[PDB]
Coordinates of C-alpha atoms (C1' of nucleotides) in Angstrom, one line a residue:
Chain A
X1 CA -16.3 -15.9 -8.5
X2 CA -18.9 -14.3 -6.2
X3 CA -20.2 -10.6 -6.1
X4 CA -18.2 -9.6 -2.8
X5 CA -15.2 -8.5 -4.9
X6 CA -14.4 -5.4 -2.7
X7 CA -12.6 -6.8 0.4
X8 CA -9.3 -5.0 1.0
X9 CA -8.0 -2.1 3.1
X10 CA -4.5 -0.9 4.3
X11 CA -2.2 1.0 6.7
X12 CA 1.5 2.3 6.3
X13 CA 4.2 -0.4 6.2
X14 CA 5.7 -2.7 8.9
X15 CA 8.2 -4.5 6.4
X16 CA 9.2 -0.9 5.6
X17 CA 11.2 -0.8 8.9
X18 CA 13.9 -2.8 6.9
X19 CA 14.2 0.3 4.7
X20 CA 14.7 2.6 7.7
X21 CA 17.6 0.5 9.1
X22 CA 19.4 0.1 5.7
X23 CA 18.7 3.6 4.2
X24 CA 20.4 5.4 7.1
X25 CA 23.8 3.8 6.2
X26 CA 23.0 3.9 2.4
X27 CA 22.4 7.7 2.6
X28 CA 25.2 8.5 5.1
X29 CA 27.8 7.3 2.5
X30 CA 26.5 10.2 0.3
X31 CA 25.6 14.0 0.6
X32 CA 23.7 14.6 -2.7
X33 CA 20.3 14.2 -4.3
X34 CA 19.1 10.7 -5.7
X35 CA 15.9 9.3 -7.3
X36 CA 13.8 6.6 -5.5
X37 CA 14.7 3.9 -8.1
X38 CA 18.5 4.7 -7.9
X39 CA 18.3 4.7 -4.1
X40 CA 16.4 1.4 -4.4
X41 CA 19.4 -0.2 -6.3
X42 CA 21.7 1.3 -3.6
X43 CA 19.6 -0.1 -0.7
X44 CA 19.4 -3.5 -2.6
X45 CA 23.3 -3.4 -2.6
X46 CA 23.4 -2.3 1.1
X47 CA 20.8 -4.9 2.5
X48 CA 20.5 -7.8 0.0
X49 CA 16.6 -7.7 0.3
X50 CA 13.5 -6.4 -1.5
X51 CA 12.3 -2.7 -1.4
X52 CA 8.9 -1.6 0.1
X53 CA 6.9 1.5 -1.0
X54 CA 9.5 4.3 -1.6
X55 CA 7.1 7.3 -1.4
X56 CA 5.5 6.3 1.9
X57 CA 8.9 5.1 3.4
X58 CA 10.9 8.2 2.4
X59 CA 8.2 10.6 3.7
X60 CA 8.0 8.5 7.0
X61 CA 11.8 9.0 7.1
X62 CA 11.5 12.8 6.4
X63 CA 8.8 13.4 9.2
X64 CA 11.0 11.5 11.7
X65 CA 14.3 13.2 10.4
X66 CA 14.3 16.8 9.1
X67 CA 17.9 16.2 7.9
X68 CA 16.2 14.2 5.0
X69 CA 14.4 16.3 2.3
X70 CA 12.5 15.9 -1.0
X71 CA 13.9 18.3 -3.8
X72 CA 11.7 16.8 -6.6
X73 CA 9.2 14.1 -7.8
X74 CA 10.6 10.9 -6.2
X75 CA 14.0 12.7 -5.7
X76 CA 15.4 12.7 -2.1
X77 CA 18.5 13.9 -0.1
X78 CA 20.1 13.5 3.4
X79 CA 22.2 16.4 4.7
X80 CA 25.3 15.6 6.9
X81 CA 25.0 13.7 10.2
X82 CA 21.5 12.0 10.5
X83 CA 22.3 12.1 14.3
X84 CA 21.8 16.0 14.2
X85 CA 18.6 15.5 16.4
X86 CA 21.0 15.2 19.4
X87 CA 24.5 15.9 17.9
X88 CA 24.4 19.6 19.0
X89 CA 28.3 19.7 19.1
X90 CA 30.6 20.3 16.1
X91 CA 31.9 17.5 13.8
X92 CA 35.0 15.4 15.0
Chain B
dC1 C1' -5.1 35.5 -14.8
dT2 C1' -4.4 34.0 -9.7
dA3 C1' -6.4 30.8 -5.9
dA4 C1' -8.9 26.8 -4.0
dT5 C1' -11.8 22.6 -4.8
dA6 C1' -12.6 18.5 -7.7
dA7 C1' -11.7 14.9 -11.2
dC8 C1' -8.4 12.9 -13.9
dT9 C1' -3.7 11.6 -15.6
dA10 C1' 1.3 9.7 -14.7
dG11 C1' 4.3 7.3 -11.0
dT12 C1' 5.3 3.7 -6.8
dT13 C1' 4.7 -0.9 -3.6
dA14 C1' 2.1 -2.1 0.9
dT15 C1' -1.0 -4.4 3.5
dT16 C1' -5.4 -6.1 4.4
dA17 C1' -8.9 -9.6 2.6
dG18 C1' -9.8 -13.9 0.2
Chain C
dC1 C1' -3.1 -13.7 -8.2
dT2 C1' -7.4 -11.1 -7.6
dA3 C1' -9.5 -6.7 -5.5
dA4 C1' -9.6 -2.8 -3.1
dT5 C1' -8.0 0.6 0.0
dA6 C1' -3.9 3.1 1.3
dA7 C1' 0.1 7.2 1.4
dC8 C1' 2.3 10.1 -1.2
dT9 C1' 4.3 14.0 -6.0
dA10 C1' 3.2 16.9 -9.6
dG11 C1' 0.5 18.8 -13.4
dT12 C1' -3.8 19.7 -16.9
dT13 C1' -8.3 20.6 -17.3
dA14 C1' -12.9 22.7 -15.5
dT15 C1' -15.9 25.4 -12.0
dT16 C1' -16.6 28.6 -8.6
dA17 C1' -14.7 33.2 -6.7
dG18 C1' -12.8 37.4 -7.3

DNA sequence: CTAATAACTAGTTATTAG
DNA sequence: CTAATAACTAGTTATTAG
């Protein structure tokens, strides 16, 4: 109704932490590039729950984990062991 | 024409406010 | 839902700079 229509504001996600925890196992079962909406269907299979903002989440994942990369528009990849931040040793 | 700033187009859901 | 502000990918068009 009234003239005070402009109300909102925002910050990066907190529900998005559900994507971090599921996406690590979702991505470790692959070693190849995937689109946001294909990785969404894969995380929906992995977790059984809804998918927060893919662009903000996947860049939050990248800045925390250089093993994750962005080859194209909404297209992402995870290289090898995500534990490579402290797995300085060879593979088993 | 190559480079940077600015406005606009096409894509994607969140979280705050009510 | 209504309403905006938010964080991010990539390209066309236009002005300023060279």
